[PDB]
Design a protein around this ligand. Structure first.
Ligand SMILES: [Zn+2]
Length: 312
């Protein structure tokens, strides 16, 4: 229980390589941890679903060898960095605690027996040089609310075709010509290759604003400069608007998104969970920053969020 020095130092080292401070046989793990990274690749994380993502990934890697321990320590390193990227700093100390309770029960008893000292759009969060973060109104879960967001799940519940305000926060103002793109993908791995689109009923219902194509799940409300993309090679849908600096006195910019199809719609999402990816891009289309959040479109956003959070 004092291998804590290994976890508390190895993770703080991977935070050093990215610019974060924590706030013998130590060298040995960093070289392997590093040497494993340049030769590798390397699953969503929320403050509530945090221990779940640790039970799953660590149990899924089937005889413990000297190679998986690096792969496990290195796994906890990316987790703490991505947790801070997602503006979820709280999980860093929690991850070290879980990294201290798995090796103590499952992984070490193998080491004392040895004792030797020698197609799919990515969803990784990047805040980028402009400090790009997402903000949400804290609207509670009373039965009458159009849209609500759950921080414990980083999940937004909204009613169909209702204003979903999403805030863009930046440390510095991106140059003119900057654009903001929204895109939905399926959350589960088995469906991530499938394009999220509207179901036949809502696709052919008289709801068009005259700007969005009838097959697009996500629309932007109140913006004549809105642009809709059906990708030439991935066939994925996205919607982009020009970024505007915050209003007079404000310090965030608010896009009004609409979700035009319900989560349980047969022929569409068919009760499958989706994520919405917001990217900041310049005029030439280079990526400046990316954040994502799960979305569910339902009839009563209030009751569904409270029902989900009461499970935590
Ligand atoms: Zn539908």
């Amino acid at each position: 229980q004092s291998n804590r020095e290994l976890v508390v130092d190895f993770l703080s080292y991977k935070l050093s390589q990215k610019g974060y401070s924590w706030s013998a046989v130590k060298q040995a793990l960093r070289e392997a941890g590093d040497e494993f990274e340049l030769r590798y690749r390397r699953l969503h994380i929320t403050p509530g679903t945090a221990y779940q993502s640790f039970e799953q990934v660590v149990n899924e890697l089937d005889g413990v060898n000297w190679g998986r321990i690096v792969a496990f320590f290195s796994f906890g390193g990316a987790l703490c960095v991505e947790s801070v990227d997602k503006e979820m700093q709280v999980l860093v100390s929690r991850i070290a605690a879980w990294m201290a309770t798995y090796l103590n029960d499952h992984l070490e008893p193998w080491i004392q027996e040895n004792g030797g000292w020698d197609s799919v759009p990515s969803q990784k969060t990047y805040q980028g040089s402009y400090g790009f973060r997402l903000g949400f109104l804290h609207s509670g879960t009373a039965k009458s609310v159009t849209c609500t967001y759950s921080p414990a799940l980083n999940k937004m519940f909204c009613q169909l075709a209702k204003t979903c305000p999403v805030q863009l926060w930046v440390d510095s103002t991106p140059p003119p010509g900057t654009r903001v793109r929204a895109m939905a993908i399926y959350k589960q791995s088995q469906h991530m290759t499938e394009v999220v689109r509207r179901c036949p009923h809502h696709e052919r219902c008289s709801d068009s604003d005259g700007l969005a194509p009838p097959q697009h799940l996500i629309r932007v409300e109140g913006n004549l400069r809105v642009e809709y993309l059906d990708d030439r090679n991935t066939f994925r849908h996205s919607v982009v608007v020009p970024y505007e600096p915050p209003e007079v006195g404000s310090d965030c910019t608010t896009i009004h998104y609409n979700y035009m199809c319900n989560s349980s719609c047969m022929g569409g999402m068919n009760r499958r969970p989706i994520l919405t990816i917001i990217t900041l891009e310049d005029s030439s289309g280079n990526l400046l920053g990316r954040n994502s959040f799960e979305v569910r479109v339902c009839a009563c956003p209030g009751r569904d969020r409270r029902t989900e959070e009461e499970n935590l």
